[PDB]
């Protein structure tokens, strides 16, 4: 009856109840999956969030820049799900770009050290999670990451755009590796959803030129989307991720599914 | 329990048991849908095929070049499904290109009259089916057509490539109209499957230069696909169509989902 | 000293002094080319226009839907340029879509007969001009057509969008044929320029919903273009065409060069 | 008479006589430009190369990871070209990826520190060269970088593919900044040319599985290219760069011109 009945799925990237990952975890549980959750840094605060999910799920610590956490991750997961059991799904819902690389800060003023950190967390980590977790994934399994279409430049998103372009490229290579295990790798390119991350970008630009341009982006998304776009509601995005975690897109890999109201298909 | 439990879905394009449409219809029925089927020209022969589906379904006549059949289609469907009921899904699985526009015939030697017929049936008909059927579609509904990625030229496919490029463009406009009804429109770009149509192209090129090149295309698809590609098996394609007919890709429209083993994401 | 010194170039599509073709012809002549011009239907009126070019050039009649004109074209050109001489360049700057397929007329209300005419003139003719003219083209030669980026749907452009999508596909196949003669084939995707054609679309939508949307398209082009966009000035487009007619893009074929101020590379 | 008569152009990336930059510099000089050259690390060896250019040109030191070299670059250039003179063109022809990120080394085994270095030199440096040099560029000017189409994954190129995907994204943002100065920014996506860099990749894979796959890539390029592809000959690529440095692509920015024999437009 549930789309993900019987599946064991790791979900990274819960930080608040608004997190795309929170809604992915919620719909997944609603659809019969057994979750393992990972969180970064503020674990006590994240546990308060995860308590509001429909079911209990273990929360493991994962800083994707921490080599020890990556090296121990498989064993920690196996310990949570029981020896002899493997994962069927992995969700990377993780991003970061130091403030110099996003927002009102001029593009040319982001030092490489900041850019490099953002690319580590937002792009390279997709590879390093796959490297850690493919060895405990079942054939038929699915790795999904989150993307924002970086095909064209835009105001404010700046070096995160560059990180997403790298992420898309990384995904195409992770698919080559994943396929050796019978595993798909794909991204969901979402339209804008009011998360802590989105709020940070918007809020940090209020009152500035970039904020005027972000306003235009926000207005235009729903306008261009043939079926509309509601920026409050992560459910449609979460459902799409669940579709890729299911067995119903079995010939799709190294690819990008756009959960954006169809906006990217319309010039206006 | 079924992905399409309760849904009423029209499926065009069954000609043999190998038809992508046959497998779409089969998986849809397996997943709890109630079908209405359309067939072109050889209706007595098609009925012998549809008898082998898991359940009985009415077969209506539809030649997409026939204006009377298009004008009467909604009423004929409503009569099959019962007054007061509407469709939730529509599958366009239809193509044709006169032999001068595909295969070994030189590209420049296809007269426009032949090209125009192929584009009518393979591209424009996506619009005219949508125009006929949106008025009897429920909000939440889904229109899916079948595509073969025409982003790059290739041997033999010739003017059908041109028809598919037009089809992708048509789909983006059908989505604008469909969205007024709460309806999604999308294509599934499939990898090669041995259907009557594919056999016709391959067979018509055996022993010729183009056949050597088609051989390379066939070999290369499974090689490039990170998860492989089996040209016998339409099931993975049919499942993808069913995914788009479901409620699990609710923010995707005017778009293309690639059910091709990930081949299009890999240069080699 | 001139980019096209010594080259013989056919230029189709002059109808008014504002025609993209007029400016292509003008810059080409400025750059040392010897032109042969083709015109459709209103030849006496077109001659009044071509008299304003910097040099005299013969004007031949070509209706691309007329099979006799296509069959006689090579011989007529050879007669204009002298036996023993061939063309180095061909410019297709031709488009048409019956009024039912563009503007305020609903997308679904364009009958196929109208759509088919538009695709004949706007897309298939690129192939049929190449078929007629490659036999009198020198190795090193160049065929260029005019495109408007149809990657995404948009208001009003409607079935012309579909014709342009087909044109891009046709160009990729013309390149395969052209390469047998040492000849490149490419499109220039221009931003909007106030021509008779553009005026017709804009004017036919004044006072209607579509006209409000065209206004947004016009405003947005210059805004998104990092170097700006001036819709009066065809020169930048004409220069780009001349670049492809030159020897300075010798490894580019089956491709699209965007002369649009960079707009297509920017979401906003 | 020369395409670049009167223009002052900086050209980075000469390491051997086979360097794409060497041929860019050579054709540019042939076409009347005045060059300033930058080299990395092996300056005495590079000077032996640059002595073989058609004219003398000053060679400045630039390690793009060195912040002092970047901070002093404009002043050093101005000193070479004379106070009161500015650049009209800048060529970034620079790449590097530590050996763990390219070749036979498994994709997942490249540590981020190596990946980060490759992205610094191959992608971020496009921004930091633009940031250093736009302040001494004339309106009408042109910045060009070198790309290898990273739209699809492939054997061996691995993390350099990821760097190129980031580079394309960076270019789209550099165009927004450059446009404030009346300056275009674009990449040329070249087909494969036997340079020190290409030889390193090919040579490092000889005798291994990846080398078999590179062989297929090499064979397939000329096959798919409608006009062919000669991997010895950088001239066609160099000419394309010169086209973008000229005034003949005046409405193209944030974009990519493919100097690849048209291969990327053909599936096979
Ligand atoms: N919200 C949108 O509009 C939108 C649109 C498209 C794509 N996305 C993508 O969705 C994903 C989730 O973002 P969100 O909008 O839900 O925001 P969010 O702020 O809720 O989530 C971001 C997450 O990244 C995690 N993270 C940061 N550094 C980390 C590290 N070192 N190790 C592990 N995790 C780390 C944070 O802990 C947090 O859980 C991101 O990849 C984002 O780019 C968001
Ligand atoms: N088989 C593949 O490898 C492949 C790959 C990608 C996409 N596709 C697409 O899938 C769709 C189905 O093709 P298939 O491979 O199952 O072949 P098929 O030969 O089984 O189906 C083609 C169908 O088109 C129908 N058709 C033709 N003219 C018609 C008309 N005038 N009115 C109505 N229907 C008409 C035929 O009756 C037939 O049912 C097509 O759009 C095809 O281009 C096929
Ligand atoms: N103006 C723009 O903004 C713009 C933008 C992008 C692309 N384009 C393309 O540029 C090309 C030229 O259009 P334009 O804007 O200069 O308009 P225009 O109205 O000046 O030119 C259109 C031309 O098409 C010709 N034509 C129509 N039917 C013909 C037939 N049967 N045979 C031969 N020629 C025929 C007309 O005679 C006319 O010369 C077209 O392909 C158009 O789609 C224009
Ligand atoms: N050769 C091909 O087939 C091909 C194809 C497409 C694109 N390209 C691109 O062309 C460009 C030139 O490469 P090439 O093939 O001529 O190779 P090459 O080995 O001749 O040039 C590479 C250059 O990068 C320079 N470089 C490396 N680290 C540097 C640093 N820290 N600071 C400054 N310069 C540094 C080297 O000094 C060298 O001059 C690269 O961007 C490459 O990716 C090459
Ligand atoms: C700039 C246009 C506004 C619409 C942006 C849509 C969007 C919104 C949120 C997105 O998700 C993240 C996630 C993490 C992220 O990195 C962050 C988050 C907070 C602070 C910080 O320094 N980096 C940036 C964006 C995202 O990838 C895309
Ligand atoms: C030329 C490369 C071989 C792989 C082609 C993959 C493919 C195989 C079959 C496809 O489906 C159709 C359906 C109808 C069609 O039109 C036909 C079919 C039979 C005869 C005829 O004249 N036209 C052509 C292809 C399709 O769209 C794509
Ligand atoms: C709808 C958005 C407005 C911007 C459109 C930019 C554009 C403007 C003009 C273009 O050129 C043509 C050329 C012929 C053409 O067909 C015509 C022209 C006049 C009347 C008619 O029926 N068809 C349509 C557009 C073109 O291809 C694109
Ligand atoms: C893997 C398929 C073989 C065809 C690759 C075509 C290609 C050949 C050469 C290319 O240029 C570079 C330039 C620098 C570069 O970084 C290098 C060069 C030498 C050693 C090293 O560690 N990194 C890698 C490639 C390039 O970007 C693309
Ligand atoms: Cl904590
Ligand atoms: Cl833990
Ligand atoms: Cl640990
Ligand atoms: Cl909202
Ligand atoms: Cl939803
Ligand atoms: Cl019958
Ligand atoms: Cl019937
Ligand atoms: Cl009827
Ligand atoms: Cl097979
Ligand atoms: Cl399957
Ligand atoms: Cl007349
Ligand atoms: Cl005549
Ligand atoms: Cl005649
Ligand atoms: Cl204007
Ligand atoms: Cl100009
Ligand atoms: Cl030295
Ligand atoms: Cl120096
Ligand atoms: Cl210094
Ligand atoms: Cl060679
Ligand atoms: Cl050349
Ligand atoms: Na909308
Ligand atoms: Na494979
Ligand atoms: Na602008
Ligand atoms: Na070839």
Chain C CB within 8 Å of residue B168 CB? yes
What the block records as the tokens of A89 is: 């799904």
Chain B CB within 8 Å of residue A250 CB? yes
What whole-number distance in Å separates Cα of residue A77 and Cα of residue A11? 11
Chain B CB within 8 Å of residue D155 CB? yes
What whole-number distance in Å separates Cα of residue D4 and Cα of residue D11? 14
Helices B112-119/C112-119 angle, 10° precision: 130
**Gap from CA of D18 to ligand 27 centroid (Å):** 14
B46 three-class SS: helix
What the block records as the tokens of B152 is: 């790059």
Closest by CA to C13, choosing from C161, C134, C122, C86, is C122
Q: Is the CB of C121 under 6 A from ligand 3?
A: yes
What whole-number distance in Å separates Cα of residue B96 and Cα of residue C126? 22
What residues in B contact A236, CB-CB < 8 Å?
A: 250-251
DSSP 8-state symbol, B122: I
**Gap from CA of B171 to ligand 12 centroid (Å):** 26
Question: B266 to each of A188, B161, D110, D202, D214, how far by Cα in Å?
Answer: 18, 20, 20, 19, 14
The answer to whether the CB of D239 falls within 8 A of the CB of C233 is no
* Ligand number nearest to the C-alpha of B198: 6
* Ligand number nearest to the C-alpha of C176: 32
Which chains contact C through at least 3 pairs of Cβ atoms less than 8 Å apart? A, B, D
**Gap from CA of D12 to ligand 4 centroid (Å):** 9
The three-state DSSP-derived secondary structure of chain A is: CCCCCCCEEEEECCCCCCCHHHHHHHHHHHCCCEEEEEECCCHHHHHHHHCCCCCCCCEEECCCCCHHHHHHHHHHHHHHHCCCCCEEEEEECCCCCCHHHCCCCCHHHCCHHHHHHHHHHHHHHHHHHHHHHHHHEEEEEEEEEEECCCCCECCCCHHHHHHHHHHHHHHHHHHHHHHHHCCEEEEEEECCCCCHHHHHHHHHHCCCHHHHHHHHHHHHHHHHCCCCCCCCCCHHHHHHHHHHHCCCCCCCCCEEEEECCCHHHECC
What whole-number distance in Å separates Cα of residue A71 and Cα of residue A90? 16
Q: Provide the β-strand partners of residue A36.
A: A10
Chain B CB within 8 Å of residue C13 CB? no
Q: What technique solved it?
A: X-ray
Contact B251 A176 (CB under 8 A): no
What whole-number distance in Å separates Cα of residue D188 and Cα of residue D87? 20
Chain D CB within 8 Å of residue B113 CB? no
Note the residue count of chain A: 268
Beta-strand ranges (E) seen in B170-264 are: 184-190, 255-259
Chain C CB within 8 Å of residue B153 CB? yes
Contact D130 A108 (CB under 8 A): yes
Q: Is the CB of D46 under 6 A from ligand 4?
A: no
Count CB pairs under 8 A between chains B and C. Answer: 84
Measured in angstroms, the CA of C98 and the nearest CA of chain D are apart by: 30
Chain C CB within 8 Å of residue D3 CB? yes
What residues in A contact D128, CB-CB < 8 Å?
A: 108, 112
Return the H-helix or E-strand segment holding D90: strand D87-92
Burial class of C13 by CB neighbour count within 10 A (0 to 12, 13 to 18, 19+): buried
DSSP 8-state symbol, D144: E
Q: Is the CB of C190 under 6 A from ligand 7?
A: no
Backbone angles phi, psi at A262, to 5 degrees: 85, 10
What residues in A contact D97, CB-CB < 8 Å?
A: none
Chain A CB within 8 Å of residue D6 CB? no
Measured in angstroms, the CA of B43 and the nearest CA of chain A are apart by: 31
DSSP 8-state symbol, D16: S
What residues in B contact C152, CB-CB < 8 Å?
A: 172
Beta-strand ranges (E) seen in chain C are: 8-12, 34-39, 59-61, 87-92, 137-147, 184-190, 255-259
The answer to whether the CB of A126 falls within 8 A of the CB of A171 is yes
Count CB pairs under 8 A between chains C and D. Answer: 141
Backbone angles phi, psi at D221, to 5 degrees: -65, -50
Q: Is the CB of C96 under 6 A from ligand 7?
A: yes
Q: Is the CB of D94 under 6 A from ligand 4?
A: yes
Which chains contact B through at least 3 pairs of Cβ atoms less than 8 Å apart? A, C, D
Contact A264 C217 (CB under 8 A): no
Lookup result for tokens 């835009």 = A154
Measured in angstroms, the CA of C155 and the nearest CA of chain A are apart by: 7
B7 three-class SS: coil
- Which of D212, D217, D268 would you mutate first to test chain B, the one with the most B CBs within 10 A? D268
Chain C CB within 8 Å of residue A266 CB? yes
Sequence-ordered list of residues with C-beta below 8 angstroms from that of B250, at least 6 positions apart, any chain: A236, A239, A240, B184
Domain ranges of chain D: 1-268
Lookup result for tokens 């990826």 = D97
What the block records as the tokens of B241 is: 């169509």
Residue B105 CB neighbour total at 10 angstroms: 18
Helices C125-133/C67-81 angle, 10° precision: 40
Please tell me the number of Cα atoms within 13 Å of C158 on its side-chain side. 27
What residues in C contact B108, CB-CB < 8 Å?
A: 127-128, 130-131, 177
Our mutation pick for probing the ligand 3 site, out of C93, C190, C257, counting the most ligand atoms within 8 A of Cβ, is C93
Search chain A and give the residue with CA nearest D123: A162
DSSP secondary structure letters along D23-80: HHHHHHHHTT-EEEEEE-S-HHHHHHHHTTSSS---EEE--TT-HHHHHHHHHHHHHH
Search chain A and give the residue with CA nearest C224: A154
Contact A131 D150 (CB under 8 A): no
Contact C169 B161 (CB under 8 A): yes
What whole-number distance in Å separates Cα of residue C166 and Cα of residue C149? 11
Ligand 6 atom showing the smallest separation from residue B157 Cα: 1
The answer to whether the CB of B194 falls within 8 A of the CB of B231 is yes
Q: Is the CB of C53 under 6 A from ligand 7?
A: no
**Gap from CA of C234 to ligand 27 centroid (Å):** 40
The answer to whether the CB of B33 falls within 8 A of the CB of B206 is no
Contact A216 C268 (CB under 8 A): yes
Q: Is the CB of C163 under 6 A from ligand 7?
A: no
Nearest CB to A162 within list D131, D161, D170? D170
Sequence-ordered list of residues with C-beta below 8 angstroms from that of B109, at least 6 positions apart, any chain: B100
Count CB pairs under 8 A between chains A and C. Answer: 34
Chain C CB within 8 Å of residue B107 CB? yes
Sequence-ordered list of residues with C-beta below 8 angstroms from that of A57, at least 6 positions apart, any chain: A25, A29, A34, A35, A36, A37, A50
**Gap from CA of A181 to ligand 18 centroid (Å):** 16
Sequence-ordered list of residues with C-beta below 8 angstroms from that of C221, at least 6 positions apart, any chain: C191, C192, C229, C231, C260, C261, C263
- Binding residue per annotation — A157? yes
* Ligand number nearest to the C-alpha of B45: 14
* Structural resolution in Å: 2.0
Search chain A and give the residue with CA nearest D173: A153
- Binding residue per annotation — A11? no
Chain A CB within 8 Å of residue D30 CB? no
* Ligand number nearest to the C-alpha of B230: 17
CB contact residues (below 8 A), chain C span 175-214, against chain D: 175-176, 178-179, 182, 184-185, 190-191
Q: Provide the β-strand partners of residue B256.
A: B187
Closest by CA to C72, choosing from C85, C81, C63, C82, is C63
């Amino acid at each position: 009856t549930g789309l993900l009945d019987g599946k064991r799925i790791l979900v990274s990237g819960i930080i608040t109840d608004s997190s795309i990952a929170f809604h992915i975890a919620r719909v997944a549980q609603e659809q019969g999956a057994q979750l393992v959750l990972t969180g970064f840094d503020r674990l006590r605060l994240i546990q308060r969030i995860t308590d509001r999910l429909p079911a209990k799920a273990p929360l493991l610590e994962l800083d994707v820049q921490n080599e020890e956490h990556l090296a121990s991750l498989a064993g920690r997961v196996t310990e949570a799900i029981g020896a002899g059991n493997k994962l069927d799904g992995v969700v990377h819902s993780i991003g970061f770009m130091p403030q110099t690389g996003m927002g009102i800060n001029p593009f040319f003023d982001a030092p490489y050290a900041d850019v490099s950190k953002g690319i580590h967390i937002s792009a390279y980590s997709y590879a390093s999670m796959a490297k850690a977790l493919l060895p405990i994934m079942n054939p038929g399994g699915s790795i999904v990451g989150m993307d924002f279409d970086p095909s064209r430049a835009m105001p404010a998103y700046n070096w995160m755009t560059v990180a997403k372009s790298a992420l898309e490229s990384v995904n195409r290579f992770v698919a080559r590796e994943a396929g050796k295990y019978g595993v798909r790798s794909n991204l969901v390119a979402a339209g804008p959803i009011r998360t802590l991350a989105m709020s940070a970008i918007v809020g940090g630009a209020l009152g500035e030129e970039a904020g005027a341009q972000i306003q235009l982006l926000e207005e235009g998304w729903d306008q261009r989307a043939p079926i509309g776009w509601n920026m409050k509601d992560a459910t449609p995005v979460a459902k799409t991720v669940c579709a890729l975690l299911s067995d119903w897109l079995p010939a799709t890999t190294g690819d990008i599914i756009y959960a954006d109201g169809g906006a990217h298909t319309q010039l206006l």
